[PDB]
Symmetry: C2
Subunit: 189 residues, 2 copies
Amino acid sequence: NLYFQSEARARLLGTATRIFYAEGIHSVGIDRITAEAQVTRATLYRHFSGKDDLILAYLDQADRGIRAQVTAARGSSPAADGQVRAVARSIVDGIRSPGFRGCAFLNAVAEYPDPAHPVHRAVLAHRQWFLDTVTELLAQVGDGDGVAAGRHLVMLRDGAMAAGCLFDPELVSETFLHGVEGVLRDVSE
Amino acid sequence: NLYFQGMSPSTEAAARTPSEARARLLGTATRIFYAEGIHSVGIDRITAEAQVTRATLYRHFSGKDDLILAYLDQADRGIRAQVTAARGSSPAADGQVRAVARSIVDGIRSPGFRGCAFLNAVAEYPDPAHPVHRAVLAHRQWFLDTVTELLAQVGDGDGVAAGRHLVMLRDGAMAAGCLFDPELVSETFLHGVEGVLRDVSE
Ligand SMILES: [Cl-]
Ligand SMILES: [Cl-]
Ligand SMILES: [Cl-]
Ligand code: NA
Ligand code: NA
């Protein structure tokens, strides 16, 4: 459904995911989450240690889903450049999907700016994994180490995810794919 | 000073704002909302740190939303001034793009950088009907129009694709500038801008 995608626990996690992703975090109270999840507050605390734990579980779901999708993209082509293209296509398919609302991690970090906050740490860990992954792919496309190119590809991805819910998603996706082709060309020379 | 707080717009704002109480309110809201976020920061925090009563707040602003919009308006004015000054600093269309890019980098590298004020606000105000969302889109469209018009003057084409590309790099740079080594972010961004300039020139 969304780009990264006990019955009571599943309803809680699914509801928190949907609402936090679409609407934001601080503005969304556990009373609304429990009401929409059709559980009580006591049931929420039976599964999660509080709102913070629930937020982290939401982000963990997103992390796991994205990792699976990026891994599947890497599995979809035997060629390093084909794998980069497949990752880029996955990103676009998310951007153009109904209910796209930007990067879950960039949206969370806007609200959790203290670097040592667990939400902030989760954001940085996910981002570093993604940077490492695309850097490694690009290192296999050309003779160089892919380090500068990886940063470049991440910059394009960050701008695409940010603008995809603020500007025509078809146009954002077109610009992003052209940018990716340019990075692939750049490293091949 | 925050990245959007230049001498010209700040001085002109001061001339428009003879109330010291109003100035403390706006300065306090700007500092805290920018650094920390918006929903998590109550008007009770702003009045305390602005050293005014709640009744003084409401004498100057109609509520929290009015104050948020005033903060974003000052950021908008400050960035417009900086970008327009950057365009004034070079007579050449490509030099103007490079100057705008240097202005962006200067902000990213500045102490207290905490990302794009507008991207951070819209993360918290996703409802397109909300005045904060509308303000963010208005600022962004002005910026896209501005760089598209510059790029249209660098090469023979209309600069439309190039302008969207430059905005994508800018958005990525602002988003990552507080999440990654700002010097490395700046280097990547400037290299990207050079690539866009080359692309439009053929
Ligand atoms: Cl109001
Ligand atoms: Cl002017
Ligand atoms: Cl600027
Ligand atoms: Na925080
Ligand atoms: Na870093």
